[PDB]
Design a protein around this nucleic acid. Sequence first.
RNA 1: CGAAUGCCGGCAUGAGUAACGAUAAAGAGGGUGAGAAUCCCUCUCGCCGUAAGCCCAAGGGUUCCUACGCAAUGGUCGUCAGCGUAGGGUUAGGCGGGACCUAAGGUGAAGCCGAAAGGCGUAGCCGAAGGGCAGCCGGUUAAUAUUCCGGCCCUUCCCGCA
Lengths: 47, 48, 95, 55, 118
Amino acid sequence: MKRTWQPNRRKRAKTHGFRARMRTPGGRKVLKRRRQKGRWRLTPAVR
Amino acid sequence: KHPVPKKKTSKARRDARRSHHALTPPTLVPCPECKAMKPPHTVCPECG
Amino acid sequence: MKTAYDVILAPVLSEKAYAGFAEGKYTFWVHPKATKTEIKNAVETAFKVKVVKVNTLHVRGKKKRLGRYLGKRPDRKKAIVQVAPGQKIEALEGL
Amino acid sequence: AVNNHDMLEDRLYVKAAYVDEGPALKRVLPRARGRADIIKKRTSHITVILGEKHG
Amino acid sequence: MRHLKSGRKLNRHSSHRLALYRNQAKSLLTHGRITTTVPKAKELRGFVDHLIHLAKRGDLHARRLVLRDLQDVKLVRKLFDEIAPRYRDRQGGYTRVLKLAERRRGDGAPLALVELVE
RNA sequence: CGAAUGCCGGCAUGAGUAACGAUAAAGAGGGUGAGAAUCCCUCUCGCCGUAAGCCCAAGGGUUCCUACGCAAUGGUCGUCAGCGUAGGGUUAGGCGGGACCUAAGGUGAAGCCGAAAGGCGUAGCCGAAGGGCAGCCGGUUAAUAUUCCGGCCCUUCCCGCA
Ligand SMILES: [Mg+2]
Ligand SMILES: [Mg+2]
Ligand SMILES: [Mg+2]
Ligand SMILES: [Mg+2]
Ligand SMILES: [Mg+2]
Ligand SMILES: [Mg+2]
Ligand SMILES: [Mg+2]
Ligand SMILES: [Mg+2]
Ligand SMILES: [Mg+2]
Ligand SMILES: [Mg+2]
Ligand SMILES: [Mg+2]
Ligand SMILES: [Mg+2]
Ligand SMILES: [Mg+2]
Ligand SMILES: [Mg+2]
Ligand SMILES: [Mg+2]
Ligand SMILES: [Mg+2]
Ligand SMILES: [Mg+2]
Ligand SMILES: [Mg+2]
Ligand SMILES: [Mg+2]
Ligand SMILES: [Mg+2]
Ligand SMILES: [Mg+2]
Ligand SMILES: [Mg+2]
Ligand SMILES: [Mg+2]
Ligand SMILES: [Mg+2]
Ligand SMILES: [Mg+2]
Ligand SMILES: [Mg+2]
Ligand SMILES: [Mg+2]
Ligand SMILES: [Mg+2]
Ligand SMILES: [Mg+2]
Ligand SMILES: [Mg+2]
Ligand SMILES: [Mg+2]
Ligand SMILES: [Mg+2]
Ligand SMILES: [Mg+2]
Ligand SMILES: [Mg+2]
Ligand SMILES: [Mg+2]
Ligand SMILES: [Mg+2]
Ligand SMILES: [Mg+2]
Ligand SMILES: [Mg+2]
Ligand SMILES: [Mg+2]
């Protein structure tokens, strides 16, 4: 039956994207934290 | 519903359960021409 | 500098590569950023030939593993080029 | 026996023998309602020990 | 119970277990000896003996009969012309079942031999 | 440390038990191989057929092709594989999208408002499974083909001539 992940590569780059995060102070701080924790990927990988 | 065992069964009691589990060796007869062994009323692997 | 010898990496060695020698068509590994236009001159300048048609295609490298060490081989592009009719590349004629 | 310890094949019997239990490889068996048990494919160390009949 | 009920179902319904004996027969009347499981063998037995006996009767009817099962003109010719003749002075027992001494693996099943007689 | 339905690990019991995932269905002969119900070929049988066939878009990301393999993965087996190793393979002025258009909405010189962060907003800009725009049919490879080749057409830009 229809489940929760319906992958779409545009939605992903538009929603969790890098330019996404950077537009909003909420989201610059997302990147700041991820960068500080030393995440390898700051942001979802969509192809 | 959903019945369950009440006690881990003991090393004594599971082994005794198995008293019948032992195998019995194959039934074997000497072959009509070749030297070898065969189950009775079958066709010999050698010299059928 | 960028000179022609940068645009052209190596010849591609395969049945399918060779099989085109017999028509005007010679295929190399080229630098991935290099456009159809400039690949032409780079091959003209290097092998002193006339180039008439270019075909490019990217070859995205294979993922391989050394055992818990998992990565991928680097990415490519290849060009198959058409020399003017009758011209050849004697450099590439050793089969 | 014959080939190493010079034992004379024709009189060989099985003196003693046994299988101890090796290290078990575990795998996941997915189940109803999300559940996932683990089943263990096991391992045996088989040992046959030969000696010479006395006849 | 079963109680003087006789004849095997082997884990097949009516359709498929018919089609089985027909197919087994087609293969015995072709190769003259065959290898199956002991029970599939023992049930073949009579299924061909009748098919054979009808070739021994030889007439257009008995042929049209045998075509119901074997379905194939060529295989039937082999039956009427070249097989039944070896049997014409023989009363029944046109086949023989001997069991093989080794059994399948991953199966465990005992196998036997089914060959036409002599 | 003996208990906290404690925490982490390891190993038991139930048990050689339940199951082994659509009741569309199998049989034989032959081949290969240390080893075959399970791989390959032939024959017969059965099941789909507005599909259980074939194309396209998502999404997936080498799974494609071929050689050598069977520890593990495969609910058994495996000599087989979507599995291990390795090599190869995706070719476009016209197909799709961009050096075109605008839609919702987004964003935004001007302007306006808000402790700060920010919120708004004309025109513009961005934005498409809409509008616009020139390639048909065969043949070719183990593996690509309106892409390579064959035949027969067409578009735009630049320069020249009338
Ligand atoms: Mg629906
Ligand atoms: Mg989930
Ligand atoms: Mg999309
Ligand atoms: Mg890194
Ligand atoms: Mg430099
Ligand atoms: Mg291209
Ligand atoms: Mg289950
Ligand atoms: Mg689930
Ligand atoms: Mg347990
Ligand atoms: Mg009953
Ligand atoms: Mg059954
Ligand atoms: Mg029926
Ligand atoms: Mg206490
Ligand atoms: Mg019980
Ligand atoms: Mg039971
Ligand atoms: Mg059961
Ligand atoms: Mg089933
Ligand atoms: Mg052989
Ligand atoms: Mg062999
Ligand atoms: Mg129809
Ligand atoms: Mg895709
Ligand atoms: Mg996946
Ligand atoms: Mg892989
Ligand atoms: Mg394959
Ligand atoms: Mg192979
Ligand atoms: Mg394996
Ligand atoms: Mg296995
Ligand atoms: Mg592979
Ligand atoms: Mg644009
Ligand atoms: Mg331009
Ligand atoms: Mg626009
Ligand atoms: Mg705004
Ligand atoms: Mg607006
Ligand atoms: Mg569009
Ligand atoms: Mg359109
Ligand atoms: Mg177009
Ligand atoms: Mg294909
Ligand atoms: Mg075509
Ligand atoms: Mg063409």
